[PDB]
Amino acid sequence: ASTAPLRISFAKIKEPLEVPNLLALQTESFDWLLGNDAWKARVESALESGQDVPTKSGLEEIFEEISPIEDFSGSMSLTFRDHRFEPPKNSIDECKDRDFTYAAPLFVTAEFTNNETGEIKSQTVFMGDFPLMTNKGTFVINGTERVVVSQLVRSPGVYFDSSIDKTSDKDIFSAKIIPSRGAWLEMEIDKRDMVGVRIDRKRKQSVTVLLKALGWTTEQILEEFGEYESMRATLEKDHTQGQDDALLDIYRKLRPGEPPTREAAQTLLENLYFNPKRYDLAKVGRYKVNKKLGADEPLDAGVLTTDDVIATIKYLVKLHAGETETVGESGREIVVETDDIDHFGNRRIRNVGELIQNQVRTGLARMERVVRERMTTQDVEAITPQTLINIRPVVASIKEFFGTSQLSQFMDQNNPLSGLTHKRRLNALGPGGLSRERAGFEVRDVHPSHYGRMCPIETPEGPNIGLIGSLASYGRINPFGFIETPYRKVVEGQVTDDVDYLTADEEDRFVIAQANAALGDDMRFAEARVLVRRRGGEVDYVPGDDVDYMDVSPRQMVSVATAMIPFLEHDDANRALMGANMMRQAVPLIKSESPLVGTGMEYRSAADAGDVVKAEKAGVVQEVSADYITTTNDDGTYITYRLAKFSRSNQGTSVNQKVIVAEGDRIIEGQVLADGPATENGEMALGKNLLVAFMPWEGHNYEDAIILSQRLVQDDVLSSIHIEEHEVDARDTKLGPEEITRDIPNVSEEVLADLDERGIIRIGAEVVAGDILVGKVTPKGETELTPEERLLRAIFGEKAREVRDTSLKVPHGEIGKVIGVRVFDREEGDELPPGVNQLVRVYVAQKRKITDGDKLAGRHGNKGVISKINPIEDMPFLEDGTPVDIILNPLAVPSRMNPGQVLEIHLGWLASRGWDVSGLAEEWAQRLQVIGADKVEPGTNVATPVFDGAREDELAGLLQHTIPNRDGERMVLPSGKARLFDGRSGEPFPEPISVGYMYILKLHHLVDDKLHARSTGPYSMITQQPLGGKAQFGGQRFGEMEVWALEAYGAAYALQELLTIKSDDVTGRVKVYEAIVKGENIPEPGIPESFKVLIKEMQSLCLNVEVLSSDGMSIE
């Protein structure tokens, strides 16, 4: 009811299914991994509801997979029966503040049992801390919020490939079994008119030797395979016969250099595949191989069998022979056809639970090897579960995962939308998967399967284009790791209010309709002709009652970020892609305002994001305050929520949280109490909405730059807080300890004016470049006073003391008011890393206003740098005196092919000035009246779903019927344009101009962070050239193409200076600085240092690289 603020909806079709919990992907996966009360609760709920679900947890499963250790005598066994957790010792805010990984204890009961002793000894053992996940899907590790992103991988199973070889002039067919963990096997057919096997691609071999090595004899082999001539030819050309002969031959081929041994070869073959540990095919692997090969109920979990290998062989030859339908081996009839790897039925997401489970599995395998070694080197009756197990591997693996991994990525807290879009990404890059180098054309390209499973619009535009994509809005994860999507049920031409979840393979069989298809007054189709899609991504139509499934909501195919854009359908795919990528960089402002025109879904995106603070009880607020808010449920429990205030996010932006609820207002469960960064009344607000007019203006908005009023600078409309945090540590060196003191040496008196007693900058003291934040002094150093220093000290009677200044100073080019300081002391109860006696962190916070050079951008991928901020008067103002808040070049929109922004501007103007439509008897008027969006007051927001937006007819009609804002006249003509009076000249512009309200965002590509200059600064060490980066005064790199261009000019002396004087020559740099300061002419360049580095290096490869002159030896 009161969940969200009122937002007029222009939607035309009702949505049966509601959007799920948008963060389900992480929270449910980790719930399953922990196997805590929540996972089992969902398991029993599904079981009583009849829905399938894995009823075994994640941790307990990996423990159970470890069988009790058996020595060579097999006397002994350890049982890891039951695992349990305890509440974590540190609070979440606590862990964030003192930099502790948010973890909890993990115990398990180890039972020792020996047949020789015939006794059972049970004891509980603690495996280590376990990095736990907070309720908002983040791992607070070392004080930094990480997030583990899913990973796309090729599912284990069998994959058949068809190709054409130009040399052979004939098709070539291959098969590959990709295991979950074990070594890989391939089966190529008719490579050169015979079939052969690749056992890890070790050597050339035939199929007949493999079959003979198995117990299957030649007679039954040809009996089963006498119907295909190719395999008969392979059999007859194979001279070797007998199981022993084939086995010894293959053993010799695989491991040459030793005589063949029957038992050794059989054990090797059993070990490589049939052993359950080395070839542990995941449950998904067997689940899919049984369906593909058609085998009716094979072993639920286990290794490939000889029957499976023969079935794959028969499948391959059936495929090659051209037959398209054949009886499955020990199974029903099945289609035999090549399978494309890129199909989303073959692609599996390794959700966070599975990744952490795999790392725990590796750690436990190391633990198993360690305990086996200990058992082999330990005496009986002195063996206890407490003593034998080493917990170092598990902790050292789960710790080396969350740090130093591609999938455990630093959270980007630019705004709640960026949070969600980081949570839902499916990074195809990672260990054991498609790397950046391995990328091809096929993987990046969209597939017809990516519909409701992976947003095709949004993705990084960098070199990793398409490899990383966001999960669709309605996506859900199959327990095997595939992605499902919801579809409604259709029967006898009547779409029903029932939903089924379809994976990427089940979707193929049925024919799926389109949600946009209209429906009659009755539940039946209004039109016999209806658009449909079917196998292979075909889009052909099928009139009448023939479909069974239709999309439940038209926004199935679009992720959250792309779903936010209004009027998406009118934009090109490229500009919508750029607009989705950009919307994840808008920084929060001082005061946030929800879009006047936007999707109807921003409420859900804001709410399910963890930034917002919502109530867990339905009561009455008793005390509302900026820092905290107290609520009292009717039961009696009192709960106070603490609102974070100006706490630095990961991106150095404020997370100030406002308060919306009054004192005595009633509350409901899940209702919103306090906004987050870039939010308003629980509605997402990534920026402000400005009055935009489209016109070129004196060329200051040339090439897509932007002109905006000084009104925005004046009223702080676009202003953002930025909090930087830099820290210094009082460490002890071999000379002595470091002191944090106000008594810094060789300084003036006034520099240390605002410092505190112990040498810390006070709170609330504005700083600038060079200001002293905390005063630190080196213990001492061997000082050999130079003769000039000696004389000067004697003259002035000053004592140059061994203690040397090393205080922290604000880096160059900075400004801000300090807001907080934190001190941690070794001698105090607080703990610190070794050596560091004290550590001090200071927050410096400024209010960056919108200025020139700042990067601004809208929702539809139209971005530009500010080029000028005219005064309020220079703005071409409207008929009622309102200046336009921003000018944008029209030339962008035709070529950029994103006329959605023009639509948005017109509808924003419409939203700003209300409209009244009653009894007009017009078609659009009837649609508005039935929808309920007829009588709209000025100012209220309006909603246009991403693919059920307002038709242009609606916009035209409402433009005709806008509310008169003043005097009874409408400033915008029916065309949607208005008369603009040039502010500077004063005369009206020759023709009307398009104006309205457009939602702009302030990107994080701020100029202040990009700016960087360098006279002279730090130099590298191994090669004396200047070093790179902004934080270290880094000179820009004069790449190869720069020297090419300079050569093209014929400019040689500039090149000489830019290569020798301006870097890479130690002698010349001091000389040129001295000559410039003294005014003397620049001296002659010498030789560069990198050349001497190279000649020394090629001297150390035993190449006597000698520099010689024409007349004997040269002078250098």
Place this chain on the structure above:
Amino acid sequence: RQAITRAMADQARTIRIPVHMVEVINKLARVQRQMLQDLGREPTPEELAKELDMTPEKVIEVQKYGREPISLHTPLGEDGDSEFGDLIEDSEAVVPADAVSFTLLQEQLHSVLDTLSEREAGVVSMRFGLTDGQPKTLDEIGKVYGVTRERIRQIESKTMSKLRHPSRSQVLRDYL
């Protein structure tokens, strides 16, 4: 085992640790692992100190001595943005600002000394080694110049006074 352990101690770590230090570090490491196993928590330094029977200072010393270097030529964090050996600055590089400031100081000081009388400037120069890196004691000056140790002391004192006048102090004050 003797040879393997000895040579593992003497040739495994980049910074050669003496054998007694190797056994001390490995002993404290294994016992610390043990106490982590029993207590299930990170032991406090004092408990470790009393376990090893040595003082906490030795505990910290060996704990810091038992580290390993990190390779410069490692991925710095991005795809290919150089390595860890291309982000840390050196100390031996002569900051050209410092060099030019020092040369200007030398020039100004030499000019100010030239302002003084020849013998006075000379004696102060030898007293502070402005011609040579080794300054000469008062008596040490009274051999090439032919003045008594107390006489050269006296004129050195008068030079110190003269240069301390506000006249020849405005320029040199600003160089510290």
Place this chain on the structure above:
Amino acid sequence: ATADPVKDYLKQIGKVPLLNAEQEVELAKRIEAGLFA
């Protein structure tokens, strides 16, 4: 001569006769005989 030199080392060990008690005591006997020689 192959990659992973430890494998070639293991092959270089090859097959050599493991020594039972009397074999090695006799070997040590002739060792001390040669020592006195």
Place this chain on the structure above:
Amino acid sequence: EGIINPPIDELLEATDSKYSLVIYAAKRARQINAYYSQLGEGLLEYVGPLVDTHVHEKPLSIALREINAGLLTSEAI
């Protein structure tokens, strides 16, 4: 009062090339800068600016001004 203040065409037709113009004006600019930084030796070889000079100036502007006036001449060894 600008980089383009002495137009280039006269300089090219004076020196018959463009690279020769750059190096020759650079040599002259070096000479005038060395003169301005004499600070008292008064070497007879050095020659000051032939054209009028501002209180603060770049040597190269004066060198190119001299080339434009044409009073200066070059000669290859």
Place this chain on the structure above:
Amino acid sequence: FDELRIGLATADDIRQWSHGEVKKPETINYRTLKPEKDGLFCEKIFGPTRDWECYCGKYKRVRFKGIICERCGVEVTRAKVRRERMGHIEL
């Protein structure tokens, strides 16, 4: 700079380049943080770590440069010589 002649470096040439022989894998003492003797980073063969400063605490000032102290053998000079001087290993 007229020609960068390059060719096979014989053993005699590598001996000629070397200012000494490296006999140990020692790099730096774990406590004093100074180069060890005759190993890698040795000053007796490569050069002094600090400008004109020898190893043993004997001649330690810019004045008396260009001499070898008989205690540790370090030749006092600028530390930059460590960027030029190179040793060799006899196999």
Place this chain on the structure above:
Amino acid sequence: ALKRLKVVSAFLQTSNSPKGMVLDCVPVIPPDLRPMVQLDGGRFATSDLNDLYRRVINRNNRLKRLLDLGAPEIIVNNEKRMLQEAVDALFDNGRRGRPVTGPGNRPLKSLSDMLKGKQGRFRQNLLGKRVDYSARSVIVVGPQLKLHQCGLPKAMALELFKPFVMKRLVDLNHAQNIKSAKRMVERGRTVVYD
């Protein structure tokens, strides 16, 4: 025979003898080029050449000890092979079989590897060098400028022209001496901008 003639004649004409194929003495890079530089925090930075040189020195020492005492042919031959592998890894790590992974996370760098590739010396620190006296920033459009004019923000211009601003400040007596000029420009007073 053509290729054989090419190489053999190339060796015949050149004065150097072929025996340079088999090196006897291994040069070691100057230490400053393979720095074991101190790091704050008690940690260390080491270049992989240190590891490879340690390996070759260790194996040579062990070979010398094995030769000193009467040792079997098998052990000494395997030791010489170990030395050969170490030298090969030093000059080119990864040119035969698996590379010398060292820590195990990544192959160790070798001499030839520093002289090769995109990150090698030739293409990264001899053709394209970093340069002092430079700057970078976003660009906006300025129409009022003339064709040969570009706008530099105050901070970048002041930082680029530090030596020149110092010289001009001392010459006009705005600053007493050079160090005071440095202090004044760092302060950023109005006269500095003038």
